[PDB]
Scaffold this active site. Structure first.
Site, PDB file in Angstrom:
ATOM      1  N   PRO A  44      -0.703  -7.545  -5.906  1.00  0.00           N
ATOM      2  CA  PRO A  44       0.274  -6.375  -5.666  1.00  0.00           C
ATOM      3  C   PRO A  44       1.473  -7.023  -4.820  1.00  0.00           C
ATOM      4  O   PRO A  44       1.560  -8.066  -4.568  1.00  0.00           O
ATOM      5  CB  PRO A  44      -0.625  -5.720  -4.483  1.00  0.00           C
ATOM      6  CG  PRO A  44      -1.988  -5.815  -5.094  1.00  0.00           C
ATOM      7  CD  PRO A  44      -2.063  -7.317  -5.695  1.00  0.00           C
ATOM      8  N   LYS A  49       2.080 -14.347  -2.148  1.00  0.00           N
ATOM      9  CA  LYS A  49       2.558 -15.145  -3.404  1.00  0.00           C
ATOM     10  C   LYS A  49       3.559 -16.055  -3.166  1.00  0.00           C
ATOM     11  O   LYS A  49       3.622 -17.500  -3.319  1.00  0.00           O
ATOM     12  CB  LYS A  49       2.648 -14.247  -4.629  1.00  0.00           C
ATOM     13  CG  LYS A  49       1.491 -13.514  -5.248  1.00  0.00           C
ATOM     14  CD  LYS A  49       1.801 -12.600  -6.133  1.00  0.00           C
ATOM     15  CE  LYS A  49       2.584 -11.165  -5.733  1.00  0.00           C
ATOM     16  NZ  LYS A  49       2.390 -10.324  -6.560  1.00  0.00           N
ATOM     17  N   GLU A 263      -0.712  23.118   9.452  1.00  0.00           N
ATOM     18  CA  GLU A 263      -1.497  21.846   9.840  1.00  0.00           C
ATOM     19  C   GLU A 263      -2.609  22.457  10.654  1.00  0.00           C
ATOM     20  O   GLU A 263      -3.558  21.635  10.427  1.00  0.00           O
ATOM     21  CB  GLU A 263      -0.535  21.145  10.811  1.00  0.00           C
ATOM     22  CG  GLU A 263       0.137  20.150   9.895  1.00  0.00           C
ATOM     23  CD  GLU A 263       1.471  20.981   9.446  1.00  0.00           C
ATOM     24  OE1 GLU A 263       1.558  22.172   9.484  1.00  0.00           O
ATOM     25  OE2 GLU A 263       2.346  20.256   8.647  1.00  0.00           O
TER      26      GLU A 263
HETATM   27  N1  LIG Z   1      -1.592 -14.465   4.473  1.00  0.00           N
HETATM   28  C1  LIG Z   1      -0.482 -14.343   4.946  1.00  0.00           C
HETATM   29  N2  LIG Z   1      -0.275 -15.021   6.391  1.00  0.00           N
HETATM   30  C2  LIG Z   1       0.875 -14.572   6.868  1.00  0.00           C
HETATM   31  N3  LIG Z   1       1.839 -13.869   6.340  1.00  0.00           N
HETATM   32  C3  LIG Z   1       1.730 -13.171   5.264  1.00  0.00           C
HETATM   33  C4  LIG Z   1       0.480 -13.542   4.304  1.00  0.00           C
HETATM   34  N4  LIG Z   1       0.567 -12.902   3.572  1.00  0.00           N
HETATM   35  C5  LIG Z   1       1.794 -12.115   3.396  1.00  0.00           C
HETATM   36  N5  LIG Z   1       2.557 -12.466   4.498  1.00  0.00           N
HETATM   37  C6  LIG Z   1       3.738 -11.863   4.982  1.00  0.00           C
HETATM   38  O1  LIG Z   1       4.337 -11.561   3.378  1.00  0.00           O
HETATM   39  C7  LIG Z   1       5.687 -11.994   3.530  1.00  0.00           C
HETATM   40  C8  LIG Z   1       5.923 -12.488   2.043  1.00  0.00           C
HETATM   41  O2  LIG Z   1       5.461 -11.726   1.071  1.00  0.00           O
HETATM   42  P1  LIG Z   1       5.342 -12.272  -0.330  1.00  0.00           P
HETATM   43  O3  LIG Z   1       6.673 -12.712  -0.524  1.00  0.00           O
HETATM   44  O4  LIG Z   1       4.072 -13.017  -0.605  1.00  0.00           O
HETATM   45  O5  LIG Z   1       5.196 -10.907  -1.239  1.00  0.00           O
HETATM   46  P2  LIG Z   1       5.465 -11.147  -2.926  1.00  0.00           P
HETATM   47  O6  LIG Z   1       3.888 -11.394  -3.316  1.00  0.00           O
HETATM   48  O7  LIG Z   1       6.509 -11.827  -3.290  1.00  0.00           O
HETATM   49  O8  LIG Z   1       5.733  -9.566  -3.134  1.00  0.00           O
HETATM   50  P3  LIG Z   1       6.782  -9.313  -4.481  1.00  0.00           P
HETATM   51  O9  LIG Z   1       6.177 -10.108  -5.449  1.00  0.00           O
HETATM   52  O10 LIG Z   1       6.822  -7.821  -4.639  1.00  0.00           O
HETATM   53  O11 LIG Z   1       8.049  -9.796  -3.847  1.00  0.00           O
HETATM   54  C9  LIG Z   1       6.001 -12.742   4.757  1.00  0.00           C
HETATM   55  O12 LIG Z   1       7.170 -12.772   5.284  1.00  0.00           O
HETATM   56  C10 LIG Z   1       4.727 -12.837   5.394  1.00  0.00           C
HETATM   57  O13 LIG Z   1       4.982 -12.552   6.754  1.00  0.00           O
END
Ligand SMILES: Nc1ncnc2c1ncn2[C@@H]1O[C@H](COP(=O)(O)OP(=O)(O)OP(=O)(O)O)[C@@H](O)[C@H]1O
Ligand SMILES: Nc1ncnc2c1ncn2[C@@H]1O[C@H](COP(=O)(O)OP(=O)(O)OP(=O)(O)O)[C@@H](O)[C@H]1O
Ligand SMILES: [Mg+2]
Ligand SMILES: [Mg+2]
Ligand SMILES: [Zn+2]
Ligand SMILES: [Zn+2]
EC number: 3.4.24.-
Lengths: 439, 439
Positions: A44, A49, A263
């Site tokens: 998601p 990622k 509510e």
């Molecule tokens: N396991 C984790 N530890 C620390 N921070 C996390 C972790 N997972 C997510 N984050 C936070 O999520 C952000 C990055 O999200 P990410 O880029 O992984 O999303 P995404 O998978 O790229 O979503 P999309 O594909 O919609 O862009 C970072 O700024 C970080 O702070």
């Protein structure tokens, strides 16, 4: 650094064996093993990622090439294929490298022999580059995507994308790990226990937890305070779960009394129905885009859903309509109710088509290709849906006629105060005044 | 070279005899035969097409020009045709040569009246170069596509691409040969029998078995082992058939109890049901994205499916929800059952629309052009399907009524003893104690 990805231990591992495979090959390639040609990352939005990919590029030590999945098709025919030929050309022109293509949906759509044209000319070139006639080695490729099933079958094949890794929402333990990581680099006080915040945020990603900590810190500094504490984290948590409040928008007394009864209707309907989720704040301050909202917060963050819980939810989504229809008479029901009425319909359909909870229809899945079934079975299905809805309405009024006193008392509770906690709702139903300010 | 392609011995025979034509023509040009002008290669992804192309290029002992379907068609008009003319000019210039246009899906597109006047210029040039006006001899052309019917009719016309060769997923013996080939680089133990694994992977291509062996080796070398042995192949085969293990999860005892009853239901319905596929291991350890899975497994990999076996599949799909209904009462049915129903309905339609296994519908194929029949026969068909599913679930409910003792016995045998095996399942369903520790 890989320590910055707290939670999602399996995915961090399954890239970490790739990294330490690169650093000392002979500890791994003794029995004949060799590098995996590709890792896919699915899950998601906002889970880690792109984060995991940036950590691999940070701890690997080899040249790392990154491109979005959209930097390819400029406006001609055959421009994307040229850029993949030059991308992998530069890639294999040096040592074992890694090639992170982000948003792999934009060039990964499956090709269907009905209109295949210049459109799918980039995908075929990528396929010929990952595993083609000329076998190169040393190149690893990593690609992320929100949509695993939209991708072609020739991309997700072994030999091109050797292993698939899914990064999804964390549970309570990993959640508390994420908060423990982001509660660093902020001047915390005592009183702060991240397990408490983790128990009260079911269904939040990493991006939303980190945002929680950030705007809680900024709200702390803006009150001229000196350290961050559970009142601030509780405030920002409410700003994420419910929405930003608005102590303005002057409005008459008849209106705010009416919302008080609406509510109030949702609250009383949700507090005395077997199966409903546990209750949370229930205000009439206009917060978000709504005019008051009764929020419910689960504790055991379930993934499934029973039938009694579906009916209980289906009854919670009508206590406002039945409430003001029992106070203001029938010809004075407004049109705001229709909004939450909307959501109730969705639930009822899932109870009949997808989940299979109607004995008149059967244990069949009419959900996908709803347009392939005939017209008789859809008549029976939709009739069953409407029967569910009006039965739930009847239950709702049968219950709100026997709880009239709690309805009025809680209405006055929401009209004197502006908000209420959970046990504050309970005591306001019982009648003992609360230790706080009558706004 | 041709000994590296284990399985699909027909395609291998065709190319072997072509290169055998280029070795000693006189064994073949006696009665007046001449070479094939072209060999096309069709089959699903990963079955060894580009591999056979590598083999023929390696052993043919003559020039071998290779391109992809995407290395044509750059920005300007008439560049793709130009490159084809130059490609066959070099081809004629050099020698009796071979030419491999991998991924013919790009340029071999079907012609239609609504193409935009410049798409099919490259294709037309390919046609006037293969069997045009100035005929010649000495050039052979090889092509690979996954989508044979998605090709134009003038590429497949004999005279152009004489032989249409069909690579396809191997049978049991083929998988044994592939595994025996790929294990020649793995430092093996003496408890390795590839026939076992070949009988264990019914439906995998060659590439999936390749990286099965690879991951088994790498996992062997993580454990500080000395030689890859049978337990490692078991590990990796389980990883591919079911997914990663995901050790770190918090699980309320009520949750894993309910799960053990669900897979207990599937396992019993697959145990004592006539015609059902023989039962492999049934676990509740949270593999991949599912919270536990019972996994059946065939024996003689036939392609047909009788009507007895189909109804067996429907009952095996209904057994889970029937289990939760028999234990937790009717109101406590969850929504996980949807993922079961969505499969069963599929099978039901194949029993009625296309396989011809109904009495009111008839011996008629309602499958192709489902949207073109009337509204009366589709009512009859869907009524037939709904009846199949309902009778299925009632059979399942009294079957699990008679076998109640074994149901509790195996449910308790899964709350203890994660991931039982089929033999171990039968020991648990009588009352024995397993020769292994509890978790
Ligand atoms: N396991 C984790 N530890 C620390 N921070 C996390 C972790 N997972 C997510 N984050 C936070 O999520 C952000 C990055 O999200 P990410 O880029 O992984 O999303 P995404 O998978 O790229 O979503 P999309 O594909 O919609 O862009 C970072 O700024 C970080 O702070
Ligand atoms: N029959 C086989 N014997 C040995 N190895 C095989 C066989 N089939 C596939 N492989 C493995 O698969 C790899 C290449 O598969 P191949 O390129 O033939 O797939 P493909 O036909 O191109 O499918 P696609 O066109 O969808 O990519 C090789 O590296 C090899 O290890
Ligand atoms: Mg991203
Ligand atoms: Mg290929
Ligand atoms: Zn409402
Ligand atoms: Zn199931």
């Amino acid at each position: 650094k890989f320590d910055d990805v707290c939670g999602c231990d399996e995915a961090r591992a399954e890239l970490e064996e790739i990294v330490d495979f690169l650093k000392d090959p002979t500890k791994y390639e003794s029995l004949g093993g060799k590098l995996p040609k590709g890792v896919l990352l699915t899950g998601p939005p906002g889970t880690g990622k792109t984060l995991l990919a940036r950590a691999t590029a940070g701890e690997a030590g080899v040249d790392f090439f990154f491109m979005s999945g959209s930097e390819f098709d400029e406006v001609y025919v055959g421009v994307g294929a040229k850029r993949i030929r030059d991308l992998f050309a530069q890639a294999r022109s040096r040592a074992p490298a890694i090639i992170f293509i982000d948003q792999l949906d934009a060039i990964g759509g499956k090709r269907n022999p009905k209109d295949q044209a210049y459109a799918k000319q980039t995908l075929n070139q990528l396929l010929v580059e990952l595993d083609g006639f000329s076998q190169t080695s040393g190149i690893i490729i990593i690609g992320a995507t929100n949509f695993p099933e939209a991708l072609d079958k020739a991309l997700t094949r072994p030999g091109r994308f050797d292993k698939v890794v899914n990064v999804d929402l964390p549970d309570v333990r990993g959640r508390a790990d994420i908060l423990k990581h982001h509660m660093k680099k902020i001047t915390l006080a005592d009183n702060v226990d991240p397990t408490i915040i983790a128990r009260g945020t079911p269904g939040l990603s990493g991006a939303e937890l980190a945002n929680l900590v950030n705007q809680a810190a900024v709200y702390a500094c803006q009150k001229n305070a000196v350290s961050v504490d559970m009142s601030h984290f509780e405030w920002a948590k409410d700003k994420i779960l419910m929405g930003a409040e608005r102590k303005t928008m002057v409005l008459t007394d008849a209106a705010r009394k009416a919302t008080a009864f609406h509510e109030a209707g949702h609250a009383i309907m949700a507090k005395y129905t077997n199966g409903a989720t546990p209750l949370y704040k229930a205000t009439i301050l206009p917060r978000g885009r709504a005019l008051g909202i009764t929020f419910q917060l689960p504790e055991m963050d379930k993934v499934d859903i029973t039938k009694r819980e579906c009916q209980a939810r289906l009854d919670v989504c009508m206590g406002g309509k039945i409430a003001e229809e029992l106070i203001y008479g029938k010809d004075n029901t407004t049109s705001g109710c229709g909004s939450d009425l909307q959501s109730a319909t969705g639930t009822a359909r899932a109870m009949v088509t997808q989940y299979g909870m109607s004995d008149d229809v059967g244990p069949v899945n009419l959900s996908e290709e709803w347009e392939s079934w005939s017209n008789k079975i859809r008549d029976i299905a939709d009739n069953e849906v409407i029967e569910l809805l009006k039965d739930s309405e009847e239950r709702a009024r049968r219950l709100l006629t026997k709880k009239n006193v709690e309805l009025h008392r809680l209405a006055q509770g929401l009209i004197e105060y502006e908000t209420l906690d959970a046990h504050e709702i309970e005591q306001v139903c019982k009648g003992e005044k609360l230790a706080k300010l009558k706004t």
